[PDB]
Design a protein around this ligand. Sequence first.
Ligand SMILES: OC[C@H]1O[C@](O)(CO)[C@@H](O)[C@@H]1O
Ligand SMILES: [Ca+2]
Ligand SMILES: [Ca+2]
Length: 520
Amino acid sequence: AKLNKDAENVVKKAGIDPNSLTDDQIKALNKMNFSKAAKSGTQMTYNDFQKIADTLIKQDGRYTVPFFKASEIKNMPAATTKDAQTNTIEPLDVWDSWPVQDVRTGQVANWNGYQLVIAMMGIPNQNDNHIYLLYNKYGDNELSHWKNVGPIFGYNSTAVSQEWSGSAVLNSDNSIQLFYTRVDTSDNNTNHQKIASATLYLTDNNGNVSLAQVANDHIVFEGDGYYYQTYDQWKATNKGADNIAMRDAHVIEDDNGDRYLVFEASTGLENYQGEDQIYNWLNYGGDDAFNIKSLFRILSNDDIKSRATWANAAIGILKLNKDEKNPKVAELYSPLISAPMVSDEIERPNVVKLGNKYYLFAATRLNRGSNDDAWMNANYAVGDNVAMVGYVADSLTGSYKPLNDSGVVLTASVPANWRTATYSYYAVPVAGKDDQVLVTSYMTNRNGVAGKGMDSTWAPSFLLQINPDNTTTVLAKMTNQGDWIWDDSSENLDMIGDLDSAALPGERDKPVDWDLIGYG
Ligand SMILES: OC[C@H]1O[C@](O)(CO)[C@@H](O)[C@@H]1O
Ligand SMILES: [Ca+2]
Ligand SMILES: [Ca+2]
């Protein structure tokens, strides 16, 4: 019935009369740990997440993904191809994709006059998660000119061993070092994820690129238990509320010759998920009134309490050894970003060097966050809850600080079941500029949610201005679908839509897809 002095201090700083509190509220407040020491890097706080959501709800043009003219959007021809699992030619969903990049600068690599992209594809509504190599003439702006070489790990594949996202760069001899996620589903169909690497040797014969050989395929890392959550840790306590993530490895080398992977994971025992996290003041990150209001809200609702108990998404970093073609872990670090209490999924981490700063971007679905009100309000306002977040550091393993106050960079602008819905935003540098990136993404959500034969395809790309004061601004500068290389000739202002033209006829009267957007 009686507050400790720390708790009475914050209550009073908050303008709350201590007498107004219940016995349960006092008990909650007396458990609060007020230590301000950071454990797993810079945190996305409960306050940050709330602000990201508020920004999405405001639909402010500085951050909204631009409207795309829905009438211009088409399936990717190269996504009609021989399927890795059925061995039959099918119209596939294509989603997460990444270009072969220069390991230092991030620029889309020119390989013998070609640009190369690696992409997740599969038959809508099947478990069919494999990666395919794609190519086009360097600088070419036509979606339909892209060509599918085929599944990197071959035909006769199955759902028992899958490939999820990662990254790709050129080695010294112009072979390709692929980083990807090896997913083994033999332990009761669980998505046992592992960061893996292999070397791709290609050949160039009369306008066609072929995959000659996949060499050195091996597991690089799958978690240590202290910095990053292991499969065994997740399996031990999972009753269905805990996410598992060890994926989306992004390779980057700095000017000291050190090569690193920046990847998606969860924290380990360094700062682990648990109900205790609801009682760490550091996680809240607002003023006293906000923090107290937030604590009571979390404890008032079983689903928010549960999400908070299980949330501990991390963007990890490790240093590799020197061996380009057979990378192994040389050193592990604490997470660059973590979201204990706040979110259990932050995806596709990406580092772009611009000038002498390192910009760390990532995609996230706010409905993987603990604050149900915030993301259910996002859904109600826009029909979706996706975002790109961003941070910036002066060195690769340095302290990352959020952009635009809260870390918000892009916010959803259309309902998740529309043709022009986007996700898996991936920023790529622009030749000759240190203050813009080109944002790529996949368009149309998977598995036919936008209707008959509306496959996931490549979005038109758009420019994002990076300002020197750790802010960003979306530009009204757009390409054709599937353009990875911005230049003067790449602009197609005809692809720009507005509120009205972002929908195909009928889409406005279409029912909500609730499994897609979530509901607390
Ligand atoms: O399909 C799995 C892939 O999709 C993502 O969740 C984003 O769409 C990535 O984190 C992962 O590599
Ligand atoms: Ca978790
Ligand atoms: Ca282009």
